[model samples]
Target: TTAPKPPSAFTVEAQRRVEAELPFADRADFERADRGLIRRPERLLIRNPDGSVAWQLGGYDFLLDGKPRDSINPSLQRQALLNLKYGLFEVAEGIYQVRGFDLANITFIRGDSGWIVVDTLTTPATARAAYELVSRELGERPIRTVIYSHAHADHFGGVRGLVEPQQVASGAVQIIAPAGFMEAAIVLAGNAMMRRATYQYGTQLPKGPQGQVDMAIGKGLARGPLSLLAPTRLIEGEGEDLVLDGVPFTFQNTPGTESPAEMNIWLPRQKALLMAENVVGTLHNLYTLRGAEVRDALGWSKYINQALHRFGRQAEVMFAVHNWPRWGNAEIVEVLEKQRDLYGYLHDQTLHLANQGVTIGQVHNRLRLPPSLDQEWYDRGYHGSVSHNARAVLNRYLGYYDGNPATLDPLSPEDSAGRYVEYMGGAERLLEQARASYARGEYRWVVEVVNRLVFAEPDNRAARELQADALEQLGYQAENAGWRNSYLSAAYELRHGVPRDQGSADALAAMDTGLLFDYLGVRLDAGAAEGKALSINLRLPDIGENYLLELKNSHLNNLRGVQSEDAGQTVSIDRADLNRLLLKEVSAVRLVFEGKLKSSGNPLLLGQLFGMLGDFDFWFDIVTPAA
Candidate 1:
């Protein structure tokens, strides 16, 4: 096309590097061991050219590599050498954001005659810091509107942190988002909890470029307070126009793309589009690793095209909630077209071939992006890649038939593992083949074969190691950081099982105590707990009162704080004591000795229950270039 290439350009190697990096791509570069307000003007959320009381923010990453020699995950090694830093950048005229702070960037848009706030940082204190930032740098603009991008907790969770509820309830500020934001949030985030979130985000993987490492885009999840402000005005249609403090704009409702209740904003005045998740730097998941309904590749592509035809040509800047901004009309237009075509390419092209009766496996081997779209930065798979996303698109439209009868009915992993073990020539023969595959750099195939073998024999350390190695290579080569993290993290665990203290600091610092109990309940050995029916009434005096704890399937469940009519054993303790027990702050037995925690029924049973639960280590393995 001979378009002037901006400095914000793409190369095959960079794409390859980012994809190989995967999950770490989203993580903030900063460890933020401690959370507080940035006092220095330069380090402030809002920065000025003079580095004085500037009404803006800046952000950066401190990528630190590590070794994986000692532990499978190399957590200790990551912590030993992994010291990452993050910088928050300025985003608006008077409004500012804590970019690179958490999953979403915190924004301060000039709303009404004052400031219109949009999506606070992930935590309460972070929001507070951002508020302070706006005050000091932007001369303390009055906040008149608070707009949540979507229902995800990160979008609106820190509403209180940014401003008081009184301000909102009193009509001092307005809250807004796409329609169905609240209702969808109830089901999605309601079902979302710690253990499940931990699993999906791969939070347990050791930190470093090698192990759990980076969050693909950022350092890790942010730590702070969380709550939600239900959107008062939901954007409903494509051309929905709203006048907020004289800022004319159109809202494009983009649901079921990156999120269930999502929207992209178009500033007719600024001619800048806040594409939300629909247009971030990373390759988006048609189906998130955390698991959600598969997004429509066709719909996703069409939405991009819609925005392009409607506004792309006139748009001067194309920026998103993630990464840096793209300036220029043609470049912006080019980005939209290419990005739109990307999903379409995967969708239309895949279907074109699939209709001719090709399996997903076959399609993957043959699929390639057209040169025009392939070279575009926007189409690069920095986050969501063509390989897996293509498969997802295929699954969505074609229904995974692949025109094969063998797939109609298949053995489950466990059953197949048993059969596969025999077919691959028993344990010894399977290991030999896997070893050879590993040597031949067929890590993916070897890992697949070895997983069945290892799960069939969890005690098979050698098979586990072999599988871990294959996963490591795949992790290394992956173009998406999420994939890389998922792979390396899995490999780390395969070698060393779950880490004990990997999430301890997070367990200790971030997640609410109530949330942890909820998480622990989910991880409970359900089958083990079903063997015996037991109940313990645990109370956290600081948090609330009247709590009933149910034990079943080797798991403990908090059914809320209420006087249970059929309680078995009751224990009284403060929130601190509960945290101590949940976070390994204190052993239950020791608590009993100290009389902090007491039970009416068999104390031994309570002890055994706690014993059954596993602790996740914060540090275990590190993924890197390898030492």
Candidate 2:
């Protein structure tokens, strides 16, 4: 681990003021975070047999015994200390949680026959480790049922670790999820979204005070064996009730909240509300820093208000898939209302400003959260910033196009960069203006000025290093974890350059054949395939599936369970082998040569079609000129 330097004077004073302004010394959150205690294992680290560390319990031990460091934001420091408390805790009667297992908490409910697990942690190894700990302390209890609250990977990826798919298949255990859960979960792998996600999570960043400090959502994401299982049962509609293993669960179908498929649970018997990711302990992203379809901020606010009016005053305790739980009906209600307002204000105010001719930077700058909401720790921008959320709201209504004529078809960043430098009388002249702005702590303005220099002459070491230094200072004082990570990541790239071989997450690993083909279709290069017209038949005898793939007019379309009579080529391969080919695990040439893939007639056309598909690089630049 690299040693973190002391904070700059600006960072020190920024943190000092936070200490004065907020109730850091308050014991309420600490008491609530530690409410349920069972037993903490001495060693919380888990590893895969290959010697890869999957999860570590003490990675953030630096925060355990130190006075708040100026190098870290005080707000982030408080969250780090809280997240460091990793162990099994009894959340309520018959309910327990294994906190800090991964980025999300794994909850356990004692059912009549066994345990009903809620939201498995991110990886198989971490989920397995957490379940093993629970069994050790709370006695061996068979898992009877599993409940998934949303479509997010962290909530369901580790199902295999908790139970076998065969167990679910044979009716030994039932897996329940919201409607269209698996459909929403199925996402294409690779390219821009995955690349941005890596940065958002700080997966590649060095861990230390100045490097990857902490993820606001939780301590950190786990690196381990990923797994998933198809749900056995699906819940639909609002106020749907289900009795599982002698427990009554009232489900609220809350789509368009955190995910396309998400729901909140009301345990009337326990007087507890299971908020999933909706009413988490910290403010959430209307649009995540990680690339995703912009979330519905208006609908997101409505769901919270629905939860509040429905179960807020009635529930004695409330807990979520992330962070700790809250007790007392009043507090639960307050938390729900504040969280509701947080999203509501962001949504309503952004629209108001956009309607009033305020656009872009002005939208975020002019809009401000009321002090009543701002002072609440739970409402602070830990995972998501107000600036981005407001812009997201604007995009939801007004879209990327502001009413201004100048931005309608503005030149691409790279195309206009050289022109910008020339207009400012060359790189040296721009550097002088940027250096003056950098001296005045106008880092945002400095970023605005120096970006053109870097884009125009990417080899300019002085400009790059100066911009990086300015970014480092900006990151040092950032309260939001995502912003801090983005700033530091850009700075790191400026110094070390983007890593060429960084790989994206294999998001297509769990998808079915139809989804896989659909994903591949999106990456087809139109220009390369413009004059080409071909048809291929994929016969997967192992799965009893046949797909006729047609490429015409620069587009590819697939139809299942049929083959075109005039197909240019027919390829017969096992579904598993085809999966390997798509994942780049085995070359098509190797498969064809090895007899794993059998081709009949015009195999050259198949080869030509394959060559036209695009290959995505993991190291696409975001802050600088695009690669």
Candidate 3:
């Protein structure tokens, strides 16, 4: 393994510039983070049932000295130090939060008879550990209600750990969520998202000064089992009121904002507003680097504006899913207004430049936040930076086309890199220039130029190491954690080949017949079935759904609630059996032998169709060319 290089002089200077500019003297955030610590474990190490570490804070003890390492961005170090505050902390008189347990916090509101849990963290082991701590510190109380403010996995993936499915099924515990929670939470391209998340969260990277330090929102994603339970209640309309265990809740559905399905809750009795993931300690992502749908910036601004006008007067304190709570009505209003204006300015100014013929590639360099919004520490880009978010706004409205006729159609990266190498007098001359640029501390330019040589000649060790060094320096100087992680992850892959590690069967098992078919269609290898045509009649009596699947023209189409009598084959299987087959737990032939699956008419066609489904490679290269 190649040793990680130390920060360059330019990176150290960049860190110094940030340290001098930012309000390091202001310790308000630290005080707010540490205010309500009631109980903390001597060592915060959470282990799975098999004795594997799922989540821990001990690894981050490097930052306990509160001194910024030259390899880390100073602004990010401050955020990481603040996030070190863990354990069950009292938010208010009757509210408590388990922070630093996972990438997100699990909040407990003291209900009349039991506990009201809000936003379970990423994994079951972490959630269970937090729940055990809360129960041990305070009296053990039954969980009466589970509220999911958004449809993100970190908010609801650990439902089974807190409350058993039997409790929800028996009506003993109720789960409340926004309207489109199920559809948003159960993503169609889940495999792709999960693979990309490795780079976004730096899950495989070691936790240290030169490695993964923080995820901006929290410590990092917890490595453990992920489970899901559908919500029992949906907050459908605006101003939806619900009384849970004698506590009054007024919900505001902020759809098309952070997540397609999200809501904010205002507690009239407690006078606290739970903003969900809509507003956090850092400037949230308009377009996540992990690759998902671009969020609505204009609509996001309007939602925060609505919250400011609607609940700002009554909210005595404000808390979110990711960060510490803010007390005082004035402070809450000020933060809400600034956050509202923060998104609004990004949306407006991005378009303002776009209308003047500035392309998507140019918007990032041109658009800058005014001092009014930029001065606030919360408005800083720990997670999402102004650079990428500005480009995201352009892409959202204008799409990826930059109005340049030359860019309407472009060559692939590999093809372009080959041509660029030739145009620049071949690899030797290009490397010499890149090495000169590297010596001059022009890391950004060095990376941009040397990447062509690396892509054109993937076996060249000189090109790879130079690119890795440039990327390392960029990561060291990055104020945004996502950028830092992405840069460092790419560098690691370049230096020491991609690391191999080796889903959510619960959510897949819960998918409806139509949604399951949609996912199956995505997994189908269209090229393999180009000349093949087949039609199958699927009858799942357990779900009471019949579907006619037609494969033609390299496309799979499903007609629900109808089955053709003269189909190529007729397959009968229970939904449970189908789920097992898709999950690769049980083979179709074994199921047929066990009488769980029966087929008539061309039975071999079923086997042929299943053969056309492809599995995704989890360890695909990111920095290097894939082909």
Candidate 4:
């Protein structure tokens, strides 16, 4: 491999900062190897090879023997101690946590009657570790309840190791999440989930002591054992009080704050409020930088005010799914209030500027934290910055309209990239400017110039490597975990190539049957059947659910199952039998030979229907020099 060019003078300070923060000296193998993880990266989103749309992004990590075999990142050396030491711990007496496991914390609480598992780590392995940690501490209390405070994989991916579905079907436990939890959960996967998730948690950024930090929740999301349990009890109207296993629960719906169906929980008996993700150490995204629909700043602020007014003076302790917790009623309430206002300030100010005829870009460039909000650690931009937050806030109020009619419609990617380069006197001139900037130490500028070069001509090794160097410097200086990971991941891909894709862990075959069907249904490529109409009578005997899937308008949807004259065909099969089909224990066509799936309609038609369904691309493109 060609040696990376030296940093420009402008990048020196950033490099110095990075050098200082590294647990080891500069150029350490860990730094060199992990700093450029995407040098040749793997897919950001990996679909389950087992025909389940259940997918995962491997947490970024280094190979022990430099082989892509291990599903989880085994710690590399002694200096990775911070990650190892607090890898898992008990946050409260009955509540054990896989703390600092990844970027977020997975909490496990053992109540008198049964256990309540909170926020599964990103992957099955990590989630399994969390469950195991709590089990070892609490004698393996049955998981009576699994609470997903919000919709995020870090909070849910590791269900297989936590508890089996047999327990849920037997009525031994309860699963609870805020209203709209499932909707929020499904929505995350559609668009913003893939790209932002990689950057948000730095999923592809390799694990080592220096540049990449193994997120507290797990190094990154665990690749297998992915499951989404629909909320057992949709929280009835907000402020509803209830008791579960002798625990008094006071809840408020804080949707659109941290996530779409997000909620904040108050355990009155424990005098603690599981603020969920709402009040973390860092100010959360009004909108994330990687990309997502604009969050409602006003709605976010309003919820915070409501929660603060309700619990502020009385709540004794505060805990979240991320970061350390705080004790004392007043401190907890204040923390909640401050975060509430932070979003409110962003929302109001953005609207304020827009109403004054400011463009979204202008708002983005002009925005700054109000002194009251900026000075607080809780308000600092970690996952979301003021610049992007302003844009999010503005968009929330004004939608995507930027007032410039020129952008009423815009050229497509290829068209725009080509035209942009032409106006700049082509790639050579762009390279000249980038090279000059590189020499002048304007690494950030060099990065921007080089980005265009790659867009124009992605195969330029010099341009890709140079851009990677510039991004590495930026990752070094970034205080935010999300920002740092995203930049470094892009750099890694530029230098190395792409990490080879590792198949999901070997444990996927064992996930709950429910999760498999859920995965299949969600994984349906709506675009695959555009304007095609086909009906399938697929039946799952074990779950006792009949599915009638219809493909229309290039969309695949289930209108509910069971025979109707309206159904083109109905296939009867047991759920356990279907699970066998997905697990590959039985070939799907074998069912016809075995007479398991009785087909009245054309079996060839059914096979063709399934054939048109597209397999998911586990790896999606993130920030890259070239496609």
Q: lDDT: which candidate is best?
A: 3
Residue by residue across 220-334, what tens digits does model 2's lDDT show? 8888666777788998877488888898888898897889999998888899899999877678988887877789877888998998998887998899899899999989888
- Cα lDDT for residue 104, model 1? 62
lDDT of 3 by residue, 1-627 (tens): 367888988899999999888877878998889888989899988787768888888888899998768999898898888888888898776888999899899999998998999988887888888989988999899998999989887888777678888899999999999898888786576667777788778776888999999989898887777788888889897759888888888889999899999999898888889899999999999999888889999999999999999898788889889979889999899999999999999999999999999989999999988888887889999989999999999999999999888999998777789989999989989998888899889999999889888889988888899999999999999888888888888888888877566546788876778887887888888889889999999999997989999988888888899989779999999998888987888987799999999999988998898789987887776677883
**Local accuracy by lDDT, each model:** 0.61, 0.82, 0.88, 0.61
lDDT of 4 by residue, 1-627 (tens): 433243344444544544343333222322211221111212323334444423333332442234321111222221222232333444445555555444467776667787777776665555665555555555766778887778776676565556666676776767777887765555324444665666666665545433465443223444555565555677756746867677677778887777888778777666667778877756677676656677777778788778778876677657678765666666666677788778877777788888889988789777677666765545656556777788887777777888999988987554566677788888778777777776666766777767766766677777687788777656655555566677777776677666557322222433333344445556566666666777666676766666666656765556444445665766777765665765678887788688887776655656666676566454555545224
TM-score of each: 0.68, 0.92, 0.97, 0.76
**Per-candidate total of colliding backbone pairs:** 88, 0, 0, 42
Ranking by lDDT: 3, 2, 4, 1
Best by TM-score: 3
* Alpha-carbon lDDT of model 1: 0.61
Better model by lDDT: candidate 1 vs candidate 3: 3
lDDT of 1 at 309: 84
1-627: candidate 1 lDDT, tens digit per residue: 111111111222333444443333322222222132233344534332234321222222223323223212222123222223233344333334545555566666666578777777565655666677667765666778877776676677567666676777788777888887765554213234344445445665544344454443344455544466655577776538888887776778877677778777777777777777777655567866555567898888888888898888788766565554566787678778778878888889888888777777788777898778664444556457778777777888776677678988877666567787988788899998778776666756787788888756767767777777677666655545566657766765665566454323322333454555676665555555567777777776666766677776555767665657567676777767766676686887788789887677555665556656644433422321111
RMSD of each: 11.1, 3.0, 1.7, 8.7
The lDDT of model 3 is 0.88
User: What CA RMSD would candidate 4 show?
Assistant: 8.7
By summed lDDT, the worst window of 10 consecutive residues in model 4 runs over 32-41
